[PDB]
Design a binder for this molecule. Structure first.
Ligand code: LDA
Length: 131
């Protein structure tokens, strides 16, 4: 949805270390991931949505159509397959690798994007402010 377009800067994080832990990210990569303060730029060209994530330590970018699975190499270097869908103020991603699955749900809240990330029992919340 065009609702999500813009540039969003991280202003808060809760439980990200434990989230990366649960995904099997190693200590040394985790230390960088916890110092990152990323910017997420969401753009759209026709029906192809691009989410670019920029930081001092790693940049990533995915382009996709809603509801169509796509291959992805993640920031921590998992070779994954993901699908993004749209439901009423939320863009929801399921990301799979091996027999494993994690969810990343981006929800809009008055000028902010609240992102809930879940891997088994671990819940992480990252808040971005439109800028
Ligand atoms: C050669 C560069 C290696 C250093 C990469 C540092 C970035 C680690 C960020 C981990 C992010 C975890 N993830 C994908 C779930 O968001």
């Amino acid at each position: 949805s065009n609702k999500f377009l813009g540039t969003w800067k991280l202003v808060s994080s809760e439980n990200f270390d434990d989230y990366m832990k649960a995904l099997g990210v190693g200590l040394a990569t985790r230390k960088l991931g916890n110092l990152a303060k990323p910017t997420v730029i969401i753009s759209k060209k026709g029906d192809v949505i691009t989410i670019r994530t920029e930081s001092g330590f790693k940049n990533t970018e995915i382009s996709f159509k809603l509801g169509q699975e796509f291959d992805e190499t993640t920031a921590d270097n998992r070779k994954a397959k993901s699908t993004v869908t749209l439901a009423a103020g939320a863009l929801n991603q399921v990301q799979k690798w091996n027999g494993n699955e994690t969810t990343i749900k981006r929800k809009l809240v008055d000028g902010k994007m609240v992102v809930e990330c879940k891997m088994a029992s671990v819940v992480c919340t990252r808040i971005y402010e439109k800028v």
